[PDB]
Amino acid sequence: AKKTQEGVNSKLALVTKSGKYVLGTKATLKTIRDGKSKLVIISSNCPPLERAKIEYYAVLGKVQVVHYSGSNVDLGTACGRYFSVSVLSIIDGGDSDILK
RNA sequence: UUAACAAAAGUAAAUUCCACUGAAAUGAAUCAAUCAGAGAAGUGGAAUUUAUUGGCUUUGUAAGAAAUUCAAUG
């Protein structure tokens, strides 16, 4: 009933194709501050301090928070990128079904 | 030729931070390295160090001193 990250992992590949996402932690907070964020993904090794800042913003902004299983390196690869992504915002998912 | 201590016309090198923005066709850089979505490069700023104030030229001290000449103190 675990290792579901052939879903969200596969889902976070159509977003690279058709959707729009914002990578990073400081860039995520801007989306939550506006109404442009519909989903937030936090890696497993995000520091506990400002991880708690993102879920506090997300509660205030009424956004859904997804706790990714892998590290910021694993999340970055899942986006097809060659750096590490610790926190992700799904502004819009074109043909994927994460926002469902 | 110019001191301690102070001043702030003009103008430096290096490092670390801040704001805007968000990098992949990956870029930035050193003699070497090294660094970046826990955020690079760019632009604009803040701070500290550089034999006292604030590093260097400059200024007050201060030319009245001192050095090199001349005349018989100037």
Coordinates of all heavy atoms in Angstrom, one line a residue, chain A residues 8-90:
Chain A
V8 N 2.3 10.1 -8.7 CA 2.7 11.4 -8.5 C 4.0 11.6 -9.3 O 4.2 12.7 -9.9 CB 2.9 11.8 -7.0 CG1 4.0 12.9 -6.8 CG2 1.6 12.2 -6.4
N9 N 4.9 10.6 -9.3 CA 6.1 10.7 -10.1 C 5.8 10.8 -11.6 O 6.3 11.6 -12.3 CB 7.0 9.6 -9.8 CG 8.1 9.9 -8.8 OD1 8.2 11.0 -8.3 ND2 8.9 8.9 -8.4
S10 N 4.9 9.9 -12.1 CA 4.5 9.9 -13.4 C 3.5 11.1 -13.7 O 3.6 11.7 -14.8 CB 3.8 8.6 -13.8 OG 2.6 8.4 -13.0
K11 N 2.7 11.5 -12.7 CA 1.9 12.6 -12.8 C 2.7 13.9 -13.0 O 2.4 14.8 -13.8 CB 0.9 12.7 -11.7 CG -0.4 12.0 -11.8 CD -1.0 11.6 -10.5 CE -2.0 10.5 -10.7 NZ -2.8 10.3 -9.4
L12 N 3.8 14.0 -12.2 CA 4.7 15.1 -12.4 C 5.6 14.9 -13.5 O 6.9 15.1 -13.4 CB 5.5 15.4 -11.1 CG 4.8 16.2 -10.0 CD1 5.6 15.9 -8.7 CD2 4.9 17.7 -10.3
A13 N 5.1 14.5 -14.7 CA 5.8 14.5 -16.0 C 4.9 15.0 -17.1 O 5.4 15.5 -18.1 CB 6.3 13.1 -16.3
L14 N 3.6 14.9 -16.9 CA 2.7 15.7 -17.8 C 2.6 17.1 -17.5 O 2.3 18.0 -18.4 CB 1.3 15.0 -17.8 CG 1.0 13.8 -18.6 CD1 1.8 12.6 -18.1 CD2 -0.5 13.4 -18.6
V15 N 2.8 17.5 -16.2 CA 2.9 18.9 -15.8 C 4.1 19.6 -16.5 O 4.0 20.7 -16.9 CB 2.9 19.0 -14.3 CG1 2.7 20.4 -13.8 CG2 2.0 18.0 -13.7
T16 N 5.2 18.9 -16.5 CA 6.3 19.4 -17.3 C 5.9 19.5 -18.8 O 6.4 20.4 -19.5 CB 7.5 18.4 -17.1 OG1 8.0 18.5 -15.8 CG2 8.7 18.9 -18.0
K17 N 5.0 18.7 -19.3 CA 4.6 18.8 -20.7 C 3.6 19.9 -20.9 O 3.8 20.8 -21.6 CB 4.0 17.4 -21.1 CG 5.0 16.5 -21.7 CD 4.4 15.2 -22.2 CE 3.0 15.5 -22.9 NZ 3.2 16.3 -24.1
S18 N 2.4 19.8 -20.2 CA 1.3 20.7 -20.5 C 1.1 21.6 -19.3 O 0.6 22.7 -19.6 CB 0.0 19.9 -20.7 OG -0.1 18.9 -19.8
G19 N 1.4 21.3 -18.1 CA 1.1 22.1 -16.9 C 2.1 23.2 -16.7 O 3.1 23.3 -17.5
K20 N 1.9 24.0 -15.7 CA 2.8 25.0 -15.2 C 3.0 24.8 -13.8 O 2.1 24.8 -13.0 CB 2.2 26.4 -15.5 CG 3.3 27.5 -15.6 CD 2.7 28.8 -15.4 CE 2.0 29.3 -16.6 NZ 2.8 28.9 -17.9
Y21 N 4.3 24.8 -13.4 CA 4.7 24.6 -12.0 C 5.8 25.6 -11.7 O 6.5 26.1 -12.6 CB 5.2 23.2 -11.6 CG 6.2 22.7 -12.5 CD1 7.6 22.9 -12.3 CD2 5.9 21.8 -13.6 CE1 8.6 22.4 -13.1 CE2 6.9 21.3 -14.4 CZ 8.2 21.6 -14.2 OH 9.2 21.1 -15.0
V22 N 6.0 25.9 -10.4 CA 7.0 26.9 -9.9 C 7.9 26.1 -9.0 O 7.4 25.6 -8.0 CB 6.4 28.1 -9.3 CG1 7.5 29.0 -8.7 CG2 5.6 28.9 -10.3
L23 N 9.2 26.1 -9.2 CA 10.1 25.3 -8.5 C 10.9 26.1 -7.4 O 11.3 27.2 -7.7 CB 11.2 24.6 -9.4 CG 10.7 23.6 -10.4 CD1 11.8 22.9 -11.1 CD2 9.9 22.5 -9.6
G24 N 11.0 25.6 -6.2 CA 11.7 26.2 -5.2 C 10.8 26.5 -4.0 O 9.6 26.3 -4.0
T25 N 11.4 27.1 -2.9 CA 10.7 27.4 -1.7 C 10.3 28.8 -1.6 O 9.2 29.2 -1.2 CB 11.6 27.0 -0.5 OG1 12.3 25.8 -0.7 CG2 10.8 26.9 0.8
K26 N 11.3 29.8 -1.9 CA 10.9 31.2 -2.0 C 9.9 31.5 -3.1 O 9.1 32.4 -3.0 CB 12.2 32.0 -2.1 CG 11.9 33.5 -2.0 CD 12.9 34.3 -2.8 CE 14.4 33.8 -2.5 NZ 15.4 34.7 -3.0
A27 N 10.1 30.7 -4.2 CA 9.2 30.9 -5.4 C 7.8 30.3 -5.1 O 6.8 30.8 -5.6 CB 9.8 30.4 -6.6
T28 N 7.8 29.2 -4.3 CA 6.5 28.7 -3.9 C 5.7 29.6 -3.1 O 4.5 29.8 -3.3 CB 6.7 27.3 -3.2 OG1 7.0 26.3 -4.1 CG2 5.5 27.0 -2.4
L29 N 6.3 30.3 -2.1 CA 5.6 31.1 -1.2 C 4.9 32.2 -1.9 O 3.8 32.6 -1.4 CB 6.6 31.7 -0.1 CG 6.7 30.9 1.2 CD1 7.8 31.4 2.0 CD2 5.4 30.8 1.9
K30 N 5.4 32.8 -3.0 CA 4.7 33.8 -3.7 C 3.4 33.3 -4.3 O 2.4 34.0 -4.2 CB 5.6 34.3 -4.9 CG 5.4 35.7 -5.2 CD 6.6 36.3 -6.0 CE 6.1 36.7 -7.4 NZ 7.3 37.1 -8.3
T31 N 3.4 32.0 -4.8 CA 2.2 31.5 -5.4 C 1.1 31.3 -4.3 O 0.0 31.5 -4.6 CB 2.5 30.1 -6.1 OG1 3.4 29.4 -5.2 CG2 3.2 30.4 -7.4
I32 N 1.5 30.8 -3.1 CA 0.6 30.7 -2.0 C 0.1 32.1 -1.6 O -1.1 32.2 -1.2 CB 1.2 29.9 -0.9 CG1 1.8 28.6 -1.4 CG2 0.2 29.6 0.2 CD1 2.5 27.8 -0.3
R33 N 0.9 33.1 -1.6 CA 0.5 34.4 -1.2 C -0.6 34.9 -2.1 O -1.6 35.6 -1.7 CB 1.7 35.4 -1.2 CG 1.8 36.2 0.0 CD 2.9 37.2 -0.1 NE 4.2 36.6 0.1 CZ 5.2 36.8 -0.8 NH1 5.0 37.5 -1.9 NH2 6.3 36.2 -0.5
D34 N -0.5 34.7 -3.4 CA -1.5 35.0 -4.4 C -2.5 33.8 -4.4 O -2.5 32.9 -3.5 CB -1.0 35.3 -5.8 CG 0.2 36.3 -5.7 OD1 1.0 36.2 -4.8 OD2 0.3 37.1 -6.7
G35 N -3.4 33.8 -5.4 CA -4.3 32.6 -5.5 C -3.9 31.7 -6.6 O -4.7 31.0 -7.2
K36 N -2.6 31.7 -7.0 CA -2.1 31.0 -8.2 C -1.6 29.6 -7.8 O -1.2 28.9 -8.8 CB -1.0 31.8 -8.9 CG -1.2 33.3 -8.7 CD -2.2 33.9 -9.6 CE -2.4 35.4 -9.4 NZ -3.7 35.9 -9.8
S37 N -1.7 29.2 -6.6 CA -1.3 27.8 -6.2 C -2.5 26.9 -6.0 O -3.4 27.3 -5.3 CB -0.4 27.9 -5.0 OG 0.5 26.8 -4.9
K38 N -2.4 25.8 -6.6 CA -3.5 24.8 -6.4 C -3.0 23.5 -5.8 O -3.8 22.7 -5.3 CB -4.1 24.4 -7.8 CG -5.4 25.2 -8.1 CD -6.0 24.8 -9.4 CE -5.0 24.9 -10.5 NZ -4.5 26.3 -10.8
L39 N -1.7 23.3 -5.7 CA -1.1 22.1 -5.0 C 0.3 22.4 -4.6 O 1.0 23.0 -5.4 CB -1.2 20.9 -5.9 CG -0.8 19.5 -5.3 CD1 -2.0 18.9 -4.7 CD2 -0.2 18.6 -6.4
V40 N 0.7 21.9 -3.5 CA 2.1 22.1 -3.0 C 2.7 20.7 -2.7 O 2.0 19.9 -2.0 CB 2.1 23.0 -1.7 CG1 3.5 23.2 -1.2 CG2 1.4 24.3 -2.0
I41 N 3.9 20.5 -3.1 CA 4.6 19.2 -2.9 C 5.9 19.5 -2.1 O 6.7 20.4 -2.5 CB 4.9 18.5 -4.2 CG1 3.6 18.1 -4.9 CG2 5.7 17.2 -3.9 CD1 3.4 19.0 -6.1
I42 N 6.0 18.8 -1.0 CA 7.2 19.0 -0.1 C 8.0 17.7 0.0 O 7.4 16.7 0.2 CB 6.8 19.5 1.3 CG1 5.9 20.8 1.3 CG2 8.0 19.7 2.2 CD1 5.4 21.1 2.6
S43 N 9.3 17.8 -0.2 CA 10.1 16.6 -0.2 C 10.2 16.1 1.2 O 9.7 16.6 2.2 CB 11.5 17.0 -0.8 OG 12.4 17.4 0.3
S44 N 10.9 14.9 1.3 CA 11.0 14.2 2.6 C 12.0 14.9 3.5 O 11.8 14.9 4.7 CB 11.3 12.8 2.4 OG 12.7 12.6 2.5
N45 N 13.1 15.5 2.9 CA 14.1 16.0 3.7 C 14.1 17.5 3.8 O 15.2 18.2 4.0 CB 15.5 15.5 3.2 CG 15.9 16.1 1.9 OD1 15.0 16.6 1.2 ND2 17.1 16.0 1.5
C46 N 13.0 18.1 3.5 CA 12.9 19.6 3.7 C 13.1 19.9 5.2 O 12.6 19.2 6.0 CB 11.5 20.1 3.2 SG 11.3 21.9 3.2
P47 N 13.8 21.0 5.5 CA 14.1 21.3 6.9 C 12.8 21.5 7.7 O 11.9 22.1 7.2 CB 14.9 22.6 6.8 CG 15.5 22.6 5.5 CD 14.6 21.8 4.6
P48 N 12.7 21.0 8.9 CA 11.5 21.0 9.6 C 11.0 22.4 9.9 O 9.8 22.6 10.2 CB 11.8 20.2 10.9 CG 13.1 19.6 10.7 CD 13.8 20.4 9.7
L49 N 11.9 23.4 9.9 CA 11.5 24.8 10.3 C 10.6 25.4 9.3 O 9.4 25.7 9.6 CB 12.7 25.6 10.6 CG 12.4 27.0 11.1 CD1 11.4 27.0 12.2 CD2 13.6 27.8 11.5
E50 N 11.1 25.7 8.1 CA 10.3 26.3 7.1 C 9.4 25.4 6.3 O 8.6 25.8 5.5 CB 11.2 27.2 6.1 CG 11.9 26.4 5.0 CD 12.7 25.2 5.4 OE1 12.6 24.7 6.6 OE2 13.5 24.7 4.6
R51 N 9.6 24.1 6.5 CA 8.5 23.2 6.1 C 7.2 23.5 6.8 O 6.1 23.6 6.2 CB 8.9 21.7 6.3 CG 7.7 20.8 6.6 CD 8.0 19.4 6.3 NE 9.1 18.8 7.1 CZ 9.8 17.7 6.8 NH1 9.5 17.0 5.7 NH2 10.8 17.4 7.6
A52 N 7.3 23.8 8.1 CA 6.2 24.2 8.9 C 5.7 25.6 8.5 O 4.5 25.9 8.8 CB 6.5 24.2 10.4
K53 N 6.5 26.4 7.9 CA 6.0 27.7 7.4 C 5.1 27.5 6.1 O 4.2 28.2 5.9 CB 7.2 28.6 7.1 CG 6.7 30.0 6.6 CD 7.9 30.9 6.4 CE 9.2 30.2 6.0 NZ 10.1 31.1 5.4
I54 N 5.5 26.5 5.3 CA 4.8 26.3 4.1 C 3.4 25.7 4.3 O 2.4 26.1 3.8 CB 5.6 25.4 3.1 CG1 6.9 26.1 2.8 CG2 4.8 25.2 1.8 CD1 8.0 25.2 2.3
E55 N 3.3 24.7 5.3 CA 2.0 24.1 5.6 C 1.2 25.1 6.4 O -0.1 25.0 6.4 CB 2.1 22.8 6.3 CG 3.0 21.8 5.7 CD 3.8 21.0 6.7 OE1 4.8 21.6 7.3 OE2 3.5 19.8 7.0
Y56 N 1.8 26.1 7.1 CA 1.0 27.1 7.7 C 0.4 28.1 6.7 O -0.8 28.5 6.9 CB 1.8 27.8 8.8 CG 1.0 28.6 9.8 CD1 0.5 28.0 10.9 CD2 0.7 30.0 9.5 CE1 -0.3 28.8 11.8 CE2 -0.1 30.7 10.4 CZ -0.6 30.1 11.5 OH -1.3 30.8 12.4
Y57 N 1.2 28.4 5.7 CA 0.6 29.3 4.6 C -0.4 28.5 3.9 O -1.5 29.1 3.6 CB 1.8 29.6 3.7 CG 2.5 30.9 4.0 CD1 3.2 31.1 5.1 CD2 2.4 32.0 3.1 CE1 3.9 32.3 5.4 CE2 3.0 33.2 3.4 CZ 3.8 33.3 4.5 OH 4.4 34.5 4.8
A58 N -0.2 27.2 3.6 CA -1.2 26.5 2.8 C -2.5 26.3 3.5 O -3.6 26.3 2.9 CB -0.6 25.1 2.5
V59 N -2.5 26.2 4.9 CA -3.7 26.1 5.6 C -4.4 27.5 5.5 O -5.7 27.5 5.3 CB -3.4 25.8 7.1 CG1 -4.6 26.2 8.0 CG2 -3.1 24.3 7.2
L60 N -3.7 28.6 5.6 CA -4.4 29.9 5.5 C -4.9 30.1 4.1 O -6.0 30.6 4.0 CB -3.3 31.0 5.9 CG -3.4 31.5 7.3 CD1 -3.1 30.5 8.3 CD2 -2.5 32.7 7.4
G61 N -4.2 29.7 3.1 CA -4.6 29.9 1.7 C -5.5 28.8 1.2 O -6.0 28.9 0.1
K62 N -5.8 27.8 2.1 CA -6.7 26.7 1.7 C -6.2 26.0 0.5 O -6.9 25.9 -0.6 CB -8.2 27.2 1.5 CG -8.9 27.4 2.8 CD -9.7 28.7 2.8 CE -10.8 28.6 3.8 NZ -11.8 27.5 3.6
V63 N -5.0 25.5 0.6 CA -4.4 24.7 -0.5 C -4.1 23.3 0.0 O -4.0 23.1 1.3 CB -3.0 25.4 -1.0 CG1 -2.7 24.9 -2.4 CG2 -3.2 26.9 -1.0
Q64 N -3.9 22.4 -0.9 CA -3.7 21.0 -0.5 C -2.2 20.7 -0.6 O -1.5 21.1 -1.5 CB -4.4 20.0 -1.4 CG -4.7 18.7 -0.8 CD -4.0 17.6 -1.7 OE1 -4.2 17.5 -2.9 NE2 -3.3 16.7 -1.0
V65 N -1.7 20.1 0.5 CA -0.2 19.8 0.6 C 0.0 18.3 0.4 O -0.6 17.5 1.1 CB 0.3 20.3 2.0 CG1 1.8 20.5 2.0 CG2 -0.4 21.5 2.4
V66 N 0.9 18.0 -0.5 CA 1.3 16.6 -0.7 C 2.7 16.4 -0.2 O 3.6 17.2 -0.5 CB 1.3 16.3 -2.2 CG1 2.0 15.0 -2.5 CG2 -0.2 16.3 -2.7
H67 N 2.9 15.4 0.7 CA 4.2 15.1 1.3 C 4.9 14.0 0.4 O 4.6 12.8 0.5 CB 4.0 14.6 2.7 CG 3.6 15.7 3.6 ND1 2.6 15.6 4.5 CD2 4.2 16.9 3.9 CE1 2.5 16.7 5.2 NE2 3.5 17.5 4.9
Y68 N 5.8 14.5 -0.4 CA 6.6 13.6 -1.3 C 7.4 12.6 -0.5 O 7.8 12.9 0.6 CB 7.5 14.4 -2.2 CG 8.0 13.6 -3.4 CD1 7.2 13.1 -4.4 CD2 9.4 13.2 -3.4 CE1 7.7 12.4 -5.4 CE2 9.9 12.5 -4.5 CZ 9.0 12.1 -5.5 OH 9.5 11.4 -6.5
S69 N 7.5 11.4 -1.0 CA 8.3 10.3 -0.3 C 9.8 10.5 -0.4 O 10.5 10.2 0.6 CB 7.9 9.0 -0.9 OG 8.8 8.6 -1.9
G70 N 10.3 11.0 -1.5 CA 11.7 11.1 -1.7 C 12.3 12.4 -1.2 O 11.6 13.3 -0.7
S71 N 13.6 12.5 -1.4 CA 14.4 13.7 -1.0 C 14.2 14.8 -2.0 O 13.6 14.6 -3.1 CB 15.8 13.3 -0.8 OG 16.4 12.7 -1.9
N72 N 14.8 15.9 -1.7 CA 14.8 17.1 -2.7 C 15.6 16.7 -4.0 O 15.3 17.3 -5.0 CB 15.4 18.3 -2.0 CG 16.8 18.0 -1.5 OD1 17.3 16.9 -1.4 ND2 17.5 19.1 -1.1
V73 N 16.5 15.8 -3.9 CA 17.2 15.3 -5.1 C 16.2 14.4 -5.9 O 16.1 14.5 -7.1 CB 18.5 14.5 -4.7 CG1 18.9 13.7 -5.9 CG2 19.6 15.5 -4.3
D74 N 15.5 13.5 -5.2 CA 14.5 12.7 -5.9 C 13.4 13.5 -6.5 O 12.9 13.2 -7.6 CB 13.9 11.7 -4.9 CG 14.7 10.3 -4.9 OD1 15.9 10.3 -5.3 OD2 14.1 9.3 -4.5
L75 N 12.9 14.5 -5.8 CA 11.9 15.4 -6.3 C 12.4 16.1 -7.6 O 11.6 16.3 -8.5 CB 11.4 16.4 -5.3 CG 10.3 17.3 -5.7 CD1 9.1 16.6 -6.3 CD2 9.8 18.2 -4.5
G76 N 13.6 16.6 -7.5 CA 14.1 17.3 -8.7 C 14.2 16.4 -9.9 O 13.9 16.9 -11.0
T77 N 14.7 15.2 -9.7 CA 14.7 14.2 -10.9 C 13.3 13.9 -11.4 O 13.1 13.8 -12.6 CB 15.4 13.0 -10.4 OG1 16.7 13.3 -9.9 CG2 15.5 12.0 -11.6
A78 N 12.3 13.8 -10.5 CA 11.0 13.5 -10.9 C 10.4 14.6 -11.8 O 9.4 14.4 -12.5 CB 10.1 13.3 -9.7
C79 N 11.0 15.8 -11.7 CA 10.6 16.9 -12.6 C 11.5 17.0 -13.9 O 11.3 17.9 -14.7 CB 10.6 18.2 -11.9 SG 9.9 18.2 -10.3
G80 N 12.3 16.0 -14.1 CA 13.2 16.0 -15.2 C 14.3 17.0 -15.1 O 14.9 17.4 -16.2
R81 N 14.7 17.5 -14.0 CA 15.6 18.6 -13.8 C 16.9 18.0 -13.2 O 16.9 17.0 -12.5 CB 15.1 19.7 -12.9 CG 14.5 20.8 -13.7 CD 13.0 20.7 -13.9 NE 12.4 21.9 -14.1 CZ 12.2 22.5 -15.3 NH1 12.5 21.9 -16.4 NH2 11.6 23.7 -15.4
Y82 N 18.0 18.7 -13.4 CA 19.3 18.3 -13.0 C 19.8 18.9 -11.7 O 21.0 18.8 -11.4 CB 20.3 18.5 -14.2 CG 20.0 17.7 -15.4 CD1 19.1 18.2 -16.3 CD2 20.6 16.4 -15.6 CE1 18.8 17.4 -17.4 CE2 20.3 15.7 -16.7 CZ 19.4 16.2 -17.6 OH 19.1 15.4 -18.7
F83 N 19.0 19.6 -11.0 CA 19.3 20.1 -9.7 C 18.3 19.5 -8.7 O 17.5 18.6 -9.0 CB 19.2 21.7 -9.7 CG 18.1 22.2 -10.4 CD1 16.9 22.4 -9.9 CD2 18.3 22.7 -11.7 CE1 15.8 22.9 -10.6 CE2 17.2 23.2 -12.5 CZ 16.0 23.4 -11.9
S84 N 18.3 20.0 -7.5 CA 17.4 19.5 -6.4 C 16.3 20.5 -6.2 O 16.5 21.7 -6.1 CB 18.2 19.3 -5.1 OG 18.5 20.5 -4.5
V85 N 15.1 20.0 -6.1 CA 13.9 20.8 -5.8 C 13.3 20.3 -4.5 O 13.0 19.2 -4.3 CB 12.9 20.7 -6.9 CG1 11.6 21.5 -6.5 CG2 13.4 21.1 -8.2
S86 N 13.3 21.2 -3.5 CA 12.8 20.9 -2.2 C 11.3 21.1 -2.0 O 10.6 20.3 -1.3 CB 13.5 21.7 -1.1 OG 13.2 21.2 0.2
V87 N 10.7 22.1 -2.7 CA 9.3 22.4 -2.5 C 8.8 22.8 -3.9 O 9.4 23.6 -4.6 CB 9.1 23.5 -1.5 CG1 7.8 24.2 -1.7 CG2 9.1 22.9 -0.1
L88 N 7.5 22.4 -4.2 CA 7.0 22.6 -5.5 C 5.6 23.1 -5.5 O 4.8 22.9 -4.5 CB 6.9 21.2 -6.3 CG 6.9 21.1 -7.8 CD1 7.6 19.9 -8.2 CD2 5.5 21.2 -8.3
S89 N 5.2 23.9 -6.4 CA 3.9 24.5 -6.6 C 3.3 24.1 -7.9 O 4.0 24.4 -8.9 CB 3.8 26.0 -6.4 OG 4.6 26.3 -5.2
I90 N 2.1 23.6 -8.0 CA 1.4 23.3 -9.2 C 0.4 24.4 -9.5 O -0.7 24.5 -9.0 CB 0.7 21.9 -9.2 CG1 1.7 20.8 -8.9 CG2 -0.1 21.7 -10.4 CD1 2.5 20.5 -10.1

